[PDB]
Design a protein around this ligand. Structure first.
Ligand code: HEM
Lengths: 189, 401
């Protein structure tokens, strides 16, 4: 699937942070973005090893070092960090089914993302209001990651419920309206 | 059996050199060690504009009456300017040898620069430059000189920038004329049916009045992308040795080995202890990179593996081409003037043949590895040059793993 991912991209070429047509300024990849990928590989290897050789158990969980007991259940159970944002959403929706669906949408909302682009500019380099909305989205994604960790009790629950409401409202509603407003400010709309 | 070039010297320092031959017409010229390299960016078109003004009349022969004289004997009058040398030459008959020399004397001294003419020649020069851009290979070689000799007087063109052309005055010209036209930096060269003693007496009679008084190769690239042009011209060069370094001969043999793009020409341009050694090719956009790859392989090959036979080919090829004796009078003298200006002497063809036959394959690949292998080139492109590779790919093609 990653090979198919690379194919569906070379047909169009990569994007640039300005979001403009970069056909006038393109360079080879071997000497310019290869040594850059090698440097990024070296930095990523520095962070991994220093997260294995010095802090090996930082990201894990201690209760996984006990054998699986069906008769007992770990008192404090939590998904690993990466799966938490979803965990929060699931817990937030009262209905079980609702939670499952929202959870799925949490990931799927992204797929839905190319149909929500209502701006005449591709990138957010020249779009400050949608930049603010994007960083608020990153902020409450971090909040949902924290909540998942917190146990079920006040006021963690309410934050979870709001944070999920704010997440879906920023992705679904606030960004296209903001893009319309930004197009209106540049005398385009 | 080729006749020797005999050189004498006047008090002025004007070396009068001549090489007699049976041909009854002669090419008498004056070479001057003065070009765009001696200009200091405030008079960047002084030599070119003086080269335009030099045939428009003198003090003794005012205006077109002067050129009426060179029509009267049916002689031909030519002049050219490079980055280091300026030449004023006349092709005439043998029996018209005195007056021609006298004519050349006026052209170098006693010349008259008319203010009226200055405006007319400014419009000529300006317009030509305004249309000179048309000649691509000239644009590409000027770009190669600029990007290879950045910050030096060897980057600036012979014609100069339109700016200076417009902003030039008689006095400035007078200066360039009075500064870079010294007698010790001048050679009176004659080739063909001339006697050396008669030419020496004529130089003593006229022209005896002429007054007696580094560069850094920036390996880099200039690309003028203009996609509307049908063809692309690309020149790639490295630093040359200079005039006085004998391995030039060996490098010439290397060029004779090279001799995919519609047009592929190799050059060894030499200036005073510097130069540009490389290749210029003119191609369609969709071929450019392949050409470059091809070309770099050849060079690398010579530096890496070169046989004995091909060397022989180059030796022989160069020999015939180097052959210039009785090629033409104009060429013959041109060689006398350049030899007295650059080497200080006329190198005979027997010495050239000895330096050619001492070249073998081992010293050719040694000298080619000295000058081509792992060197930073200067690249100049003009036209649809998007597929022309950037500097890392060319620099990596300058060596083999
Ligand atoms: C681990 C799985 C994935 C791999 C290995 C992968 C790999 C790649 C690679 C190698 C590129 C080439 C450009 C670049 O790396 O910057 C790329 C481009 C891209 N990927 Fe992914 N990708 C993955 C998952 C995703 C996901 C989940 C998304 C959507 C959220 C995504 C969206 C994109 C987009 C939009 C581009 C084009 C960006 C650009 O080149 O301007 N990819 N991917």
């Amino acid at each position: 699937l990653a090979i198919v991912h690379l194919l569906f991209l070379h047909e169009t070429g990569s994007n640039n942070p300005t979001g403009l047509n970069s056909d006038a300024d393109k360079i080879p990849f071997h000497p310019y973005y290869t040594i850059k990928d090698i440097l990024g590989i070296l930095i990523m290897f520095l962070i991994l090893m220093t997260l294995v050789l010095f802090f090996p158990d930082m990201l894990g969980d201690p209760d996984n070092y006990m054998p699986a007991n069906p008769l007992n259940t770990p008192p404090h159970i939590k998904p690993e960090w990466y799966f938490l944002f979803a965990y929060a959403i699931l817990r937030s929706i009262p209905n079980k089914l609702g939670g499952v669906l929202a959870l799925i949408l949490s990931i799927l909302i992204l797929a839905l993302m190319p149909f929500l682009h209502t701006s005449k500019q591709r990138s957010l380099m020249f779009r400050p209001i949608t930049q603010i909305l994007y960083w608020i989205l990153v902020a409450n994604l971090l909040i949902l990651t924290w909540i998942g960790g917190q146990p079920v009790e006040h006021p963690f629950i309410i934050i979870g419920q709001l944070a999920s409401i704010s997440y879906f409202s920023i992705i679904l509603i606030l960004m296209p309206i903001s893009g319309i407003i930004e197009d209106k400010m540049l005398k385009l709309y | 059996s080729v006749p020797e070039t005999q050189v004498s010297i006047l008090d002025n320092g004007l070396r009068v050199a001549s090489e007699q031959s049976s041909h009854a017409t002669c090419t008498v010229g004056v070479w001057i060690d003065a070009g765009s390299r001696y200009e200091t960016e405030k008079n960047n078109g002084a030599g070119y504009f003086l080269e335009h003004l030099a045939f428009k009349g003198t003090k003794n022969r005012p205006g077109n009456a002067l050129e009426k004289e060179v029509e009267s004997i049916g002689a031909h009058l030519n002049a050219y300017s490079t980055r280091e040398h300026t030449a004023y030459l006349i092709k005439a008959l043998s029996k018209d040898l005195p007056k021609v020399v006298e004519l050349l004397a006026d052209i170098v001294q006693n010349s008259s620069l008319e203010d009226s003419q200055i405006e007319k020649e400014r419009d000529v020069i300006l317009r030509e430059m305004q249309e000179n851009d048309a000649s691509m290979q000239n644009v590409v070689f000027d770009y190669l000189h600029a990007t290879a000799f950045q910050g030096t007087p060897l980057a600036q063109a012979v014609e100069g920038p339109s700016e200076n052309v417009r902003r030039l005055s008689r006095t400035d010209l007078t200066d360039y004329l009075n500064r870079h036209y010294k007698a010790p930096r001048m050679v009176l060269a004659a080739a063909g049916g001339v006697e050396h003693q008669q030419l020496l007496d004529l130089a003593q009679k006229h022209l005896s009045s002429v007054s007696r008084v580094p560069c850094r190769f920036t390996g880099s690239e200039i690309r003028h992308r203009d996609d509307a042009l049908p063809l692309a011209h690309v020149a790639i060069a490295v630093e040359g040795p200079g005039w006085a370094n004998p391995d030039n001969v060996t490098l010439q043999v290397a060029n004779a080995i090279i001799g995919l793009c519609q047009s592929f020409q190799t050059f060894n341009i030499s200036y005073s202890d510097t130069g540009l050694l490389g290749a210029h090719f003119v191609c369609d956009a969709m071929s450019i990179d392949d050409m470059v790859f091809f070309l770099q392989g050849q060079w690398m090959r010579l530096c890496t593996s070169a046989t004995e036979s091909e060397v022989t080919r180059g030796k022989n090829i160069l020999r015939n081409a180097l052959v210039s004796h009785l090629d033409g009078t104009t060429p013959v003298c041109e060689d006398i003037g350049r030899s007295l200006l650059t080497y200080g002497r006329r190198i005979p063809l027997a010495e050239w043949e000895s330096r050619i036959q001492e070249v073998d394959a081992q010293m050719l690949r040694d000298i080619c590895s000295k000058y081509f292998y792992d060197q930073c080139p200067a690249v100049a492109g003009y036209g649809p040059i998007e597929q022309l590779p950037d500097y890392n790919r060319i620099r990596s093609g300058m060596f083999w793993l």
